[PDB]
Amino acid sequence: TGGLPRVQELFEARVPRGKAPIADVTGRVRLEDGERFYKITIVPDDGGEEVVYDKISKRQRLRVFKHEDGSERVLSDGDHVEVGQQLMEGSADPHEVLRVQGPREVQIHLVREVQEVYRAQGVSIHDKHIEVIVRQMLRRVTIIDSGSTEFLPGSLIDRAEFEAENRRVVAEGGEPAAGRPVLMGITKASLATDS
Numbered sequence: 001t002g003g004l005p006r007v008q009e010l011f012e013a014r015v016p017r018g019k020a021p022i023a024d025v026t027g028r029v030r031l032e033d034g035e036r037f038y039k040i041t042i043v044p045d046d047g048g049e050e051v052v053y054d055k056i057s058k059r060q061r062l063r064v065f066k067h068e069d070g071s072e073r074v075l076s077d078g079d080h081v082e083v084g085q086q087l088m089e090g091s092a093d094p095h096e097v098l099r100v101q102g103p104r105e106v107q108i109h110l111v112r113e114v115q116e117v118y119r120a121q122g123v124s125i126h127d128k129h130i131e132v133i134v135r136q137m138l139r140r141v142t143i144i145d146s147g148s149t150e151f152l153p154g155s156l157i158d159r160a161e162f163e164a165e166n167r168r169v170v171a172e173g174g175e176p177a178a179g180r181p182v183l184m185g186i187t188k189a190s191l192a193t194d195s
Contacts (some may be wrong), residue, residue: 010110013094013137018060020090022097023081024051031077038062040087044082054089059152060089061088098183104185107134137184140192144178151177156184156192 001010001017009016027045031038036058041050062075063086073079075087084093084101091113098106111130118125142155149169151157162179169175184192 003117007114010114010117011133012111012187013183014185015095018087020063020088020092021053022092022100023085023087024100026081026083028080029075029077031075037119038088040075040167042081049176056088063088078125083102088190098181099156101180103138106138107131110134112136132176133186136189138181139189140184141179142182145181146177147175148173149175149177153178156182 023042025042025044025046025048028043030041030043032040037054039052039054040057041052043050050103058171064074064143065079065081065085067073067079070072081087083099084105092109094106094109111127111134114130115125115127140156141159141162143151143153143157146153151165155191157179162177166177169177
């Protein structure tokens with residue numbers, strides 16, 4: 001997509017249409033071409049299990065990336081890629097780059113992708129205006145296990161309250177609760193305020 005639908009799908013943090021898979025583990029790519037489905041097992045460079053993306057239809061071209069050769073290289077069996085790299089052409093999924101590459105790469109991705117749409121048609125907005133809105137999209141934590149912290153495992157709570165409770169409980173009884181960062185839209189974040 002492009003234009004206003006692209007801006008909407010970027011700000012509401014939903015799964016894109018033309019989703020492009022990203023590399024899970026840094027390694028050596030083993031591109032086993034199929035009939036109508038590219039199959040690549042990307043051999044790990046440490047010894048881990050083969051992460052395989054399957055059922056990848058032939059609806060789009062491959063990714064033109066740059067390697068040690070210093071030239072625009074198409075994805076062929078023999079190349080080598082690092083963590084967090086699109087394999088085929090399209091747009092990646094923010095919820096996956098989040099976990100793969102930490103919280104900073106998500107904000108980089110979002111600001112860059114929002115600015116490309118506005119810069120294509122020649123509109124100048126400072127980056128400090130999109131950072132204010134991206135800052136509010138990453139403010140909550142999802143509990144995995146609560147232990148004895150008075151939390152329901154699976155809810156969405158603020159980072160400040162989460163760390164305050166985790167510091168209070170360990171200082172007296174002793175139990176750290178679990179939580180991983182999450183990304184929300186602008187409609188689910190507004191309906192979950194404290195008023």
